[PDB]
Amino acid sequence: GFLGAAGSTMGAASITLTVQARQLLSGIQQHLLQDGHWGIKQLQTRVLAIEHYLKDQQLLGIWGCSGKLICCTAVPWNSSWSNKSHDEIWGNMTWMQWDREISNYTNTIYRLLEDSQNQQEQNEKDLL
Amino acid sequence: GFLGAAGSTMGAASITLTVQARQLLSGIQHLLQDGHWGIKQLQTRVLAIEHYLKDQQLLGIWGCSGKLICCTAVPWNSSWSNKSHDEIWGNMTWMQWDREISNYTNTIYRLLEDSQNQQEQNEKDLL
Amino acid sequence: GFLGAAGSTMGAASITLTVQARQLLSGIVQHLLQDGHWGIKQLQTRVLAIEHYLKDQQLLGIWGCSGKLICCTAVPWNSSWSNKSHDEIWGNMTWMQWDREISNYTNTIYRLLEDSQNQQEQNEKDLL
Amino acid sequence: LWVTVYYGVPVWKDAETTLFCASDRNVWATHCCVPTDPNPQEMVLENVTENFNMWKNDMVEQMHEDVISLWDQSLKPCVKLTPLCVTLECRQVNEIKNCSFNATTELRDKKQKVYALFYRLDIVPLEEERKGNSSKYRLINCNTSAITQACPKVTFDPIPIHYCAPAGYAILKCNNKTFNGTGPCNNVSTVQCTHGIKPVVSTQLLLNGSLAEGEIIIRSENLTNNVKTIIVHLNESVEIVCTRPNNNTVKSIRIGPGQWFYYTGDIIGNIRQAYCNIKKDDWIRTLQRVGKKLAEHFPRRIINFTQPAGGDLEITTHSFNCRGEFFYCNTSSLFNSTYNPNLDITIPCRIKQIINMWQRVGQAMYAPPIEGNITCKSNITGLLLVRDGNETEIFRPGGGDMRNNWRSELYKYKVVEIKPLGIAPTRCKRR
Amino acid sequence: LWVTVYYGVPVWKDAETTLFCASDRNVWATHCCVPTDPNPQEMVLENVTENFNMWKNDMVEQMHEDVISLWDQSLKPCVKLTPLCVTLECRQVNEIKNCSFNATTELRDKKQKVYALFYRLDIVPLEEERKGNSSKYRLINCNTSAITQACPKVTFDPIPIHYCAPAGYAILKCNNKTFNGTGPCNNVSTVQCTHGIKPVVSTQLLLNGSLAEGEIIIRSENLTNNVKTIIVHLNESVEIVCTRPNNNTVKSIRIGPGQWFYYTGDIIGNIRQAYCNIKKDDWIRTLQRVGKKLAEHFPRRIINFTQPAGGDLEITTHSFNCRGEFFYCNTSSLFNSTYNPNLDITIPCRIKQIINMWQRVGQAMYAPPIEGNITCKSNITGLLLVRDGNETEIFRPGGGDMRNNWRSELYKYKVVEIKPLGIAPTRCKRR
Amino acid sequence: LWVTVYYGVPVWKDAETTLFCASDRNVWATHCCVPTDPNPQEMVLENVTENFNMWKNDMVEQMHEDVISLWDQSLKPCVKLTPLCVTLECRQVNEIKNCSFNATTELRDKKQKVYALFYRLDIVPLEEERKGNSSKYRLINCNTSAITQACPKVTFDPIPIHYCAPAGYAILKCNNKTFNGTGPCNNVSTVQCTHGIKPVVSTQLLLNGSLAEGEIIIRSENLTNNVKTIIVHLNESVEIVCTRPNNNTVKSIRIGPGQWFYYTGDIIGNIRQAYCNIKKDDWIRTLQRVGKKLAEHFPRRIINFTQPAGGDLEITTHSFNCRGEFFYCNTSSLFNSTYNPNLDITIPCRIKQIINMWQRVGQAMYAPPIEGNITCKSNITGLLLVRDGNETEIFRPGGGDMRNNWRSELYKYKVVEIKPLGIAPTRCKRR
Numbered sequence A: 001g002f003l004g005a006a007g008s009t010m011g012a013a014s015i016t017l018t019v020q021a022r023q024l025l026s027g028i029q030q031h032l033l034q035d036g037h038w039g040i041k042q043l044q045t046r047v048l049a050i051e052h053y054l055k056d057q058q059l060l061g062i063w064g065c066s067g068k069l070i071c072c073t074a075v076p077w078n079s080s081w082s083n084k085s086h087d088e089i090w091g092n093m094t095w096m097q098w099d100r101e102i103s104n105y106t107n108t109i110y111r112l113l114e115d116s117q118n119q120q121e122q123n124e125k126d127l128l
Numbered sequence B: 001g002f003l004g005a006a007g008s009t010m011g012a013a014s015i016t017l018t019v020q021a022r023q024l025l026s027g028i029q030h031l032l033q034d035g036h037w038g039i040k041q042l043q044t045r046v047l048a049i050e051h052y053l054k055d056q057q058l059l060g061i062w063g064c065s066g067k068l069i070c071c072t073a074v075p076w077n078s079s080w081s082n083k084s085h086d087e088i089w090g091n092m093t094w095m096q097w098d099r100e101i102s103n104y105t106n107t108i109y110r111l112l113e114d115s116q117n118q119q120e121q122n123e124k125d126l127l
Numbered sequence C: 001g002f003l004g005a006a007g008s009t010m011g012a013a014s015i016t017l018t019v020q021a022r023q024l025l026s027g028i029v030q031h032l033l034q035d036g037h038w039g040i041k042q043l044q045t046r047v048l049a050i051e052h053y054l055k056d057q058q059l060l061g062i063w064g065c066s067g068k069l070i071c072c073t074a075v076p077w078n079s080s081w082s083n084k085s086h087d088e089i090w091g092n093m094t095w096m097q098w099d100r101e102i103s104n105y106t107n108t109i110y111r112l113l114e115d116s117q118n119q120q121e122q123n124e125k126d127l128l
Numbered sequence D, E, F: 001l002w003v004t005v006y007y008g009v010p011v012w013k014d015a016e017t018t019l020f021c022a023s024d025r026n027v028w029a030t031h032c033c034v035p036t037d038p039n040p041q042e043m044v045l046e047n048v049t050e051n052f053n054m055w056k057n058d059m060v061e062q063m064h065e066d067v068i069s070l071w072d073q074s075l076k077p078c079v080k081l082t083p084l085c086v087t088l089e090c091r092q093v094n095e096i097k098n099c100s101f102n103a104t105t106e107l108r109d110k111k112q113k114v115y116a117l118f119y120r121l122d123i124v125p126l127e128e129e130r131k132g133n134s135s136k137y138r139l140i141n142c143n144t145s146a147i148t149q150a151c152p153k154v155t156f157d158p159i160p161i162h163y164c165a166p167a168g169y170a171i172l173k174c175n176n177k178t179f180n181g182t183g184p185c186n187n188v189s190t191v192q193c194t195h196g197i198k199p200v201v202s203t204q205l206l207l208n209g210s211l212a213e214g215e216i217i218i219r220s221e222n223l224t225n226n227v228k229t230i231i232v233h234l235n236e237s238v239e240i241v242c243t244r245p246n247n248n249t250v251k252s253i254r255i256g257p258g259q260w261f262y263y264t265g266d267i268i269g270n271i272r273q274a275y276c277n278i279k280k281d282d283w284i285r286t287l288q289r290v291g292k293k294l295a296e297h298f299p300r301r302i303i304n305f306t307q308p309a310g311g312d313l314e315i316t317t318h319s320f321n322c323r324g325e326f327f328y329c330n331t332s333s334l335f336n337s338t339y340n341p342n343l344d345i346t347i348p349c350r351i352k353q354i355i356n357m358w359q360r361v362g363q364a365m366y367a368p369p370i371e372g373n374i375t376c377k378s379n380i381t382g383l384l385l386v387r388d389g390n391e392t393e394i395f396r397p398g399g400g401d402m403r404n405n406w407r408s409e410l411y412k413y414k415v416v417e418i419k420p421l422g423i424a425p426t427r428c429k430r431r
C-alpha cells in the first residue's frame, strides 16, 4: 500500500498519492525488548524514524507548506532543471523517473523555496 | 489538572480544556544505565512521542493543524447520534459522548480526510 | 553557523536569523551503538533533543504561530516588562542581552499569548 | 449539525504503561531516587463513575516485577558462597549446630578451619546422626544453586514507595469506603503518584499496611471459589512485637580475594527460641469482627479459624524479615477459634539464614547474622485467608503469592491513558 | 511553470535498516515472537524496473548476525563443561570409545568416577595409544576454550521466519522466474515481510529450501572467478534420509550446584555407522541437469563433479544437524560424475558432539546425546559448488560460509526507504 | 508595542549534555570511532562576553567518566590472573626477584612449575626473609581483590580526542590569552568540537599537552586555599626522555583453556634501574619563570620548590605510562630549588606491573612486560603544584586526582544549549 501507483504516470499517481497519502496514514515483546541488544536496536530504529519524519515536517514548515500534502509555491520553474512542458512529467513520466531526472537540482530548488518564504515572512510583518 | 472538568459537560470542558490545554500544554541517575530500566524509560518516552505525533498527523490531514478547535466541512449525520445540540452540549459529558460515537470514529476520520482532499484539490485547481 | 550574529544587536541580526533558520534549519530536528552503555546514552540524548524540539513547536502552535519563524501577535507590549521604545532594543541591544532583560517576564508573556490565541479560536468558532 | 475536531478533550481509556517509581544504603532509596512533589495534589472528578478491578491490575504485576528485579540486582555484586559447599562436621551447641568446616582463603593453596553456628533448618545431613557426637552434614540448597550472601552494608528496609504515572497517563483513585474491589466507583479522583506503599514482604498477616477507613473489608475475586485468596483489610491495627533473644557474636573471614563471609561465631549466655508477642485482647476482637463479616458474606455457616494444613515451612507459617533475620512463626495459636452467629499471645518462631524467596528454586540467599539480639514492632493491618471448601466454613491462613500483598495496597488505583483528540457536532462549518 | 511540493510521493531509495523478525522451547519461537498477518498482501508494481543484487545485500548480513546471535544467547545460561576437561582414560567399546574420568560433584570436597562413551573425533590422545589397553585422552578443543552444553530443554529446530521491514521502509520482491543475481528485474512487487525462511544450517547441499519456479538456476557473483561460490537453486527437490542407527542409553550427572551433564551411558545392541540414503535416480537426473546448465554457462568444456579437496572435516563434508545430532557426511560418492556436451545411494556419516560453529575458534559447544536411534527426512533443494579453475571444468562441493545459505533464500528481496517528499512543476502560483 | 515571536533566536544557556567522541588495536580508536570534519570551522562571536569557569566544568567530569569506563571495558574481556595468587618462592636474581610457583594449566588435573622475574614492589612476603636464600611471598593486591591482565594486543596509547557537542548544543571556546580560568572572557568563538586532546595519564608533570599562547599561566580555584591544586600551563615545553634499559626476554604460558599469561622470563645482560633524563637548562629556566609567576601571585614570599611529603608511592612520584610500562619517578631532584624576589638531570624511576589505577581499590591490573629495552620522550607542558600553607611559600608536586589533568585541556571550553525561541516588541500586529 505504501507504493501504490509507483512507476505509474505522475498525473495518475498524484490522483492517487493525495487520496492514498491520507488513506495510508503511514508513519506518524519482552524478549525482544529486555534480552540482549534487540531492544536497543528497536529503539534506534524507532528514534531514527521519528527523526526522519520530523525532518520532512520541518522542511515543509520552512517552505510555508505546513499541514499540506499539496502546496503551490511562489518559485517559478526554471527550464534549466527540466525543459518538459508537462508533456512527459504529468504524461508519460513516473515519479521515480522524475526523481531521477531532477536528483541533481533538488538542493537548489530547496534554497529557492526557502528564499521565497523569507520574503513572504518579511512582507507578512511589513503589511501588518 | 489533566482531567479537569471530567464528567461535568462537553461545552464547559471544551472551552476550559482549550484554556486547560492552553495551560497544561500536555503531549510534550543510575536508572539511566542500570539494569533494564534505562531501556524501559526510553520505551515509555519514545512511545509517548509517537502517540503525540500520531494525533498531530491527524490534525495535519484534516487541516486542523495548529488549532485546538477546528470546524470542518463534514455535515453531521443523525445516524451517528439522534440527539443534537440538546445533550451533546447540555447534560452529557465527554466520556459518555466518546463511548457513544466510538462506533463511528473511523467513518468520521474518513469523511474528514475526504473533505480535506477535496479542499486541497480545489485549492490547487482554483489557483 | 549556530550562533552567527550573536551579540551583534537584534535589529541587524534579524535578517541573519531569518537566513539562518533556512540555511541551518536547526541543529535539532558500531562500538558506540550496541557495546557498553554508550548506546543508551546516545538514545537518551536523541530522545531529549526530540522532546525539546516538540516542546518548542507545541508552544508555537498554542500561540497561533504554527509553522512560522516570525509571527506577530495580538498582545500589546506592557511597559512594565521593558521601557525601551525601540531605541536600544532593535538599535543597540543584542538578543542575549534582551533575553537577560526579560528573563523574569517571559512566562507572563507566554500566558498572555495563550489566553489571547484561545480567545481568537473561540471568536473564530463563534463567527463561522 | 457539523463535525468539529477538539484537541485536549478530557477522555481516557484503560491502558498499561511502565510506572516510574518515586520516594521522598537502602535499595528502596537507591532505586526510586525520583523525588516526590511536596504536598501532592488530588483532583476529585465530580459525577464520574469508573469500573475498578483490583484483580487483573497491571500495577500489581509491575510492583511484583520491580520488587523481584530490585532484590536480584541488589544481590548481583555480592559474595557467592560457592566455597562453602563443603562437608560440615556439626556437633551441637554447648535447634542450632556448632559446625566446623575447611573454608578457602585468599590464596588458592591455603585453607582455614572455621567454627560457625548454623540453624538446623539450614543444614541437611550427609551421613547419619549420633546425638551427642558430631556428624557430617551439608548446607541446604548446596545441591541446587550457589548461595549469594546478602551484603551487610546494603539494607532492604521497606520505605514508602510512590508509583507515578508517565506523561500522557493518570492514576484514578477510588475514594468509596467499603468498595468491594470490582464494582463501579462513584467517588473517584485523579493523582500523579500513589500513596506511600511500604513493600513489606510477609505471609498470612499483612504488616505495616494501610488501614481501611470504614469497617473491616473482605475482598476476594470469587468468594464462592475456595481456591482464591481472601484479603481482609483491617480498619484497626493489632500490635505484634517479634524478637530474637539470642545474644550473638558475629565473626567474619575471607573466603576469597576480597570475599567476606559473615557468620555467627558464638552465642553469649543462654540460647532461647525467638518469639512474637501479639496483643491478646485486640487480636480476639479483630478475629471476632472478621468472623462476623465472614458470616455476613457466608450466611448460615459457623466460621472456623484453624491452622494451616501440613505443607512446607514457607507456606504454613507467618514469614517475615524483622531487621536482617528471617522469621517463620507458628501462628496456629492465633487461628484457633470459632464464631457461631446464633496479657499477650506468644507465638514461637524459627529463624532461617538460607532463604528461597517468591517460591523460586535455583536461587538461594544467605542472610548474614546481626551481632546481639534482634527485635521489631509491626502493626498487623491485614490478613490473607483461604476458605477450605457442611454447615461450617474453615478459614486458614494463606499467602505465598506475594502479589496478594501488593494488591492489598494497589486496590484503589487504576492507570488510564488520556485520549485528548475528540469530535463533536456544532452549529457551523469551516467555509 | 511553477514549483509545487507534494507529500506522500511514491519514491524510494536503496537503504539499510534493522528488519524485525516475525513468525506465525524453540529459540526461533522465543525470538521472532511477533505474529505475522494472515494472507500478507503482495502489491505488484506495474511497469516498475528495479536493480537487484543478491550479493552485497544487507538482509543477508542481518540474518547472519541474528542467527549466530540467537545461538550464542541460547547457549549463554547453559552448563559450562569446565569440570570435564580432565584426564579421560579410554579403552574401546566391547569410532566410539568407552572413556572414564573423575568428574566434580555438587559438593566441592567430592568426586565421582564416570564412564561415558565419546566419539573418537571429540578426543585428543594425551598419552601414547595402546590398542585394546586403556590410554589417557582429553576432550578436543578444551585448551582452546571452555565447552558449553547445549540445553536439552531448548531446541534449535528451524521454523519459517519472516523478516519484516520497519515503518517507513518496504521490501521489494522480484517475481522473475529466471533471473540471475545482479541485474534489473521487471516484475517487482512490494511486501511488508519475506516468505517463510527456515534458518537451516548446512554445507555443500542446501536442505529444506525453496525450489526455483522455472529451471535450475546457477547464480554466482563472478562465474569466471574460481574463488566465488556458485549457488545452484534446484527446481525439483531430492529426498535424503539421514539416520543414526545406534540405540543410545543416555545418563546424567551433577557436575556442580545445579549443573547437569548429559552423556551417552551405553549403546544397546550393535554399534553401526550413521548414514544418509539419497534417492539415486533423482540425484542422477539432478546432476545431469546441473551439468548441462554449467555447460551452457561454460561452453566447450567437460563438466566434472568430483569430491572436495583434502581440507578439514567441517568443510570437506556435508555437515548438518538432525534433532541436535551433528552429522558430517562424505558425499564423495555423489559428486563422482562427468557431463560431456558432445535403489538409494548410501553416504557414510561421522557424528560429532563437540562442535565449532560459524567457523569460529574459542567457542565450542557440547551437543548432548538423545536416547534411541535417530532419523531425519530432509529435502535437498540446492547446491553450493566451487569451480576449481584445460578443456574441462572441475566443480567441487563448497560451503562453510553460512552467508550463502541465507543468500539462497534472500536473493529475491531488497530493502527500500520511502522518500514521501517530492517536487514537481504545475500551472499556478502561490498567491 | 506588540509582542512578536521569533524562532531561530541566537540565545543560549549553560547546560549539561553527553558530548559524543570523535577522532581523525587502540582503545581510543575503537571508541571515538566517529570521524572529524576536515578543517572544522570556528566562528568568532564578535562583542560577546561569556562567564567561563574551568572549575566546576561538567566536561571534565564527563571526560573522567569516559576514560574510566573505556579502561574498564577494555580490560573486561582480558585474562583474569586468579590462578596466579599462590605461594611464590623468590630467591633474588643472580629490585627484581626470581620467583618460582606452581601455576595451573588447561587441564584441571595438571600443574606447571614456572620461574618468573617479578619486581619487589609487586610482592609482599608471607614468611620471613633470608638474604641469599629463597623465601615465600605472594603478589600484592590479591588479598584485596583479583588481578586482570591487560590485553597485550590492545594498546592504550593516547591519541588526540575531540569532544563534539550533540544537536542543539555548541561549545564556546575562550580565546583570551592569559585567561585566569574563572573570569569573564571578552573574546570567544563557537565550535562543534574541541581540539585534539590526548588522554595522557600522569602525575606531578603534565605530558604531551597544550602550551599556553602567552606566558606561563598559574590557575587555581582558590590560591589563598592550600588544599587546592595549582595547575601551571607552560608556554614552552621541556624535553624528558624516560627509559627502561633492562633487556627483557618475555615468556608465556597457558593458565587455563585459552588463558595466556605473559611474564618476564629472563633479563639478558646487566640489570639496571630505569631513569628519566630531563634537559637541565630548560628545566632550570622553566622553574625560575614559574617561581617568578608565583612570586607575582604571592608577594613578599620566598618561593620554595621542595619534594613531596612521605605519602604513598603513587602520589609522591611522577607516575606515568610508556608503552604500557608503568614508571614512578622520584622527582625530588627537580623540585629542589628556591626563588628569592629580592647536561641532563637524571631521575631514578621504579617500575610496577600490578597497577591500582584511578586511586581505586578492589581492582588491580597486571601490565605484561615488553621484550627488549624501552625508550620514549614526552614533552612537559603542565605542572601540578600544591602550596604547603612564615615569609616563605613551599610548593610541592601534586596530582593523583586525574580530573585536573584533563581540566588542563578543558579550561577553554563551555557547553551551551541553544534557546531558539524568543520574544521581542515590534509595531507589527497579528490583526
Ligand SMILES: *[C@@H]1O[C@H](CO)[C@@H](O[C@@H]2O[C@H](CO)[C@@H](O[C@@H]3O[C@H](CO[C@H]4O[C@H](CO)[C@@H](O)[C@H](O)[C@@H]4O)[C@@H](O)[C@H](O[C@H]4O[C@H](CO)[C@@H](O)[C@H](O)[C@@H]4O)[C@@H]3O)[C@H](O)[C@H]2NC(C)=O)[C@H](O)[C@H]1NC(C)=O
Residues within 6 Å of the ligand: E025, E155, E157, E200, E202, E207, E208, E320, E321, E322, E323, E324, E375, E376, E377, E378, E379
Ligand atoms: C527438514 O524438514 C524436516 C521436516 O520438518 C525435518 O525433519 C523433522 O525434524 C524434526 C526436528 O528435527 C522432527 O521432530 C521430532 O520428531 C521426533 C520423532 O517424531 C515421531 O515420533 C514421535 C514419537 O514420540 C511422534 O509423536 C511423532 O508424531 C513422529 O511420528 C520427536 O520425538 C521430537 O520430539 C522431541 O523433540 C522436540 C523438539 O524437537 C520436543 O519438543 C519433544 O518434547 C521431544 O523431546 C520432534 O518432534 C521431525 O520428526 C522430523 N520429520 C521428518 C519427516 O523427518 C528435517 O530435520 C529438516 N532438515 C534439517 C536439515 O533439519
Ligand SMILES: *[C@@H]1O[C@H](CO)[C@@H](O[C@@H]2O[C@H](CO)[C@@H](O[C@@H]3O[C@H](CO[C@H]4O[C@H](CO)[C@@H](O)[C@H](O)[C@@H]4O)[C@@H](O)[C@H](O[C@H]4O[C@H](CO)[C@@H](O)[C@H](O)[C@@H]4O)[C@@H]3O)[C@H](O)[C@H]2NC(C)=O)[C@H](O)[C@H]1NC(C)=O
Residues within 6 Å of the ligand: F152, F153, F155, F157, F200, F202, F207, F208, F320, F321, F322, F323, F375, F376, F377, F378, F379
Ligand atoms: C608523548 O608523545 C610521544 C610521541 O608520540 C610518545 O612517545 C612515543 O610513543 C609511541 C607509542 O608508544 C612510540 O611509537 C612506536 O609504537 C609502536 C607500537 O608498537 C605496537 O605495535 C607493535 C607491532 O607488532 C607491537 O609488537 C607492540 O607490542 C605494540 O603493540 C612500536 O612498535 C615502536 O617501536 C620502535 O621500534 C620499531 C622496531 O621494533 C620501529 O620500527 C619503530 O619505528 C619504533 O622505532 C614505537 O614504540 C614512540 O617510539 C614514542 N617516541 C616517539 C619519539 O615518538 C610518548 O609516550 C607520549 N607521552 C606519554 C606519557 O605517553
Ligand SMILES: *[C@@H]1O[C@H](CO)[C@@H](O[C@@H]2O[C@H](CO)[C@@H](O)[C@H](O)[C@H]2NC(C)=O)[C@H](O)[C@H]1NC(C)=O
Residues within 6 Å of the ligand: D213, D214, D215, D216, D235, D236, D289, D292
Ligand atoms: C472497625 O470496624 C468494626 C466492625 O464494623 C467496628 O466495630 C463496631 O463498632 C460499632 C460502633 O460504631 C459498635 O456498635 C459495634 O459493636 C462494633 N462491632 C461490630 C461487630 O460492629 C469498629 O468500631 C471500627 N473501628 C473504626 C476505628 O472504624
Ligand SMILES: *[C@@H]1O[C@H](CO)[C@@H](O[C@@H]2O[C@H](CO)[C@@H](O)[C@H](O)[C@H]2NC(C)=O)[C@H](O)[C@H]1NC(C)=O
Residues within 6 Å of the ligand: E214, E215, E216, E235, E236, E288, E289, E292
Ligand atoms: C527443471 O528444469 C529442468 C531444466 O530446465 C527441466 O528439465 C527439462 O525439461 C524439458 C521439458 O520437458 C525437457 O525438454 C528437457 O530435456 C529437460 N532437461 C533439460 C536438461 O532441459 C525440468 O523439467 C524442470 N522441472 C520441472 C518442470 O518440474
Ligand SMILES: *[C@@H]1O[C@H](CO)[C@@H](O[C@@H]2O[C@H](CO)[C@@H](O)[C@H](O)[C@H]2NC(C)=O)[C@H](O)[C@H]1NC(C)=O
Residues within 6 Å of the ligand: E307, E308, E309, E310, E316, E317, E329, E330, E331, E332
Ligand atoms: C571420503 O571418501 C573419499 C573417497 O574415498 C576419500 O577421498 C579420497 O579417498 C582416497 C581412497 O579412496 C584417498 O586415497 C584420498 O586421499 C582421499 N582424498 C580425500 C581426502 O578426499 C576421503 O578421504 C573421505 N573423506 C572425506 C573427504 O569426507
Ligand SMILES: *[C@@H]1O[C@H](CO)[C@@H](O[C@@H]2O[C@H](CO)[C@@H](O)[C@H](O)[C@H]2NC(C)=O)[C@H](O)[C@H]1NC(C)=O
Residues within 6 Å of the ligand: E304, E306, E336, E337, E338, E392, E393, E394
Ligand atoms: C573427469 O572425470 C572423468 C571420469 O568421469 C575422468 O576420466 C578419467 O580419466 C582418467 C585418466 O587418468 C582415467 O584413468 C579414468 O579411467 C577416467 N574415468 C574415471 C573412472 O575417472 C577425467 O579424468 C576427469 N577430468 C577432470 C580434469 O576432472
Ligand SMILES: *[C@@H]1O[C@H](CO)[C@@H](O[C@@H]2O[C@H](CO)[C@@H](O)[C@H](O)[C@H]2NC(C)=O)[C@H](O)[C@H]1NC(C)=O
Residues within 6 Å of the ligand: F042, F044, F175, F176, F177, F187, F189
Ligand atoms: C580575539 O579574537 C580575534 C578574532 O576576532 C582573534 O584573531 C583571529 O582569530 C581567528 C579565529 O579564532 C584565528 O584563526 C586567527 O589566527 C586570529 N588572528 C590573530 C592575529 O590572532 C584574536 O587572536 C583574539 N585575541 C585574543 C587575545 O583572544
Ligand SMILES: *[C@@H]1O[C@H](CO)[C@@H](O[C@@H]2O[C@H](CO)[C@@H](O)[C@H](O)[C@H]2NC(C)=O)[C@H](O)[C@H]1NC(C)=O
Residues within 6 Å of the ligand: F213, F214, F215, F216, F235, F236, F289, F292
Ligand atoms: C614564555 O614566557 C616567559 C615569561 O614567563 C618568557 O620569558 C621572557 O621573555 C622576554 C622576551 O619577550 C624576556 O625579556 C624575559 O627576560 C623572559 N623572562 C621573563 C621572566 O620575563 C618567554 O619568552 C615566553 N616564551 C614564549 C615562547 O612565549
Ligand SMILES: *[C@@H]1O[C@H](CO)[C@@H](O)[C@H](O)[C@H]1NC(C)=O
Residues within 6 Å of the ligand: D208, D237, D377, D378, D379
Ligand atoms: C503501630 O501503631 C502504633 C499505635 O498507633 C503506632 O505508635 C506505631 O507507630 C505504629 N507502627 C508500628 C509498626 O509500630
Ligand SMILES: *[C@@H]1O[C@H](CO)[C@@H](O)[C@H](O)[C@H]1NC(C)=O
Residues within 6 Å of the ligand: E044, E175, E176, E187, E189
Ligand atoms: C509477475 O509477478 C506476478 C505477481 O508476483 C505473478 O503473478 C506473475 O506470474 C509474474 N509473471 C509476469 C506476468 O511477469
Ligand SMILES: *[C@@H]1O[C@H](CO)[C@@H](O)[C@H](O)[C@H]1NC(C)=O
Residues within 6 Å of the ligand: E180, E181, E182, E183, E184, E219, E220, E221
Ligand atoms: C547477470 O546478468 C546481468 C544482466 O542482467 C549481467 O550484467 C551480469 O554479468 C550477470 N551476472 C551477475 C550475477 O551479475
Ligand SMILES: *[C@@H]1O[C@H](CO)[C@@H](O)[C@H](O)[C@H]1NC(C)=O
Residues within 6 Å of the ligand: E222, E224, E225, E226
Ligand atoms: C570478475 O569480474 C570482472 C568484472 O570486470 C571481470 O573483468 C573478470 O573477468 C571476472 N573474473 C575474474 C577472475 O576476475
Ligand SMILES: *[C@@H]1O[C@H](CO)[C@@H](O)[C@H](O)[C@H]1NC(C)=O
Residues within 6 Å of the ligand: E332, E333, E334, E336
Ligand atoms: C566413482 O565412479 C567410478 C567409475 O569408474 C568408480 O570406479 C568409483 O568407485 C566411484 N567412486 C566413488 C567416490 O563413488
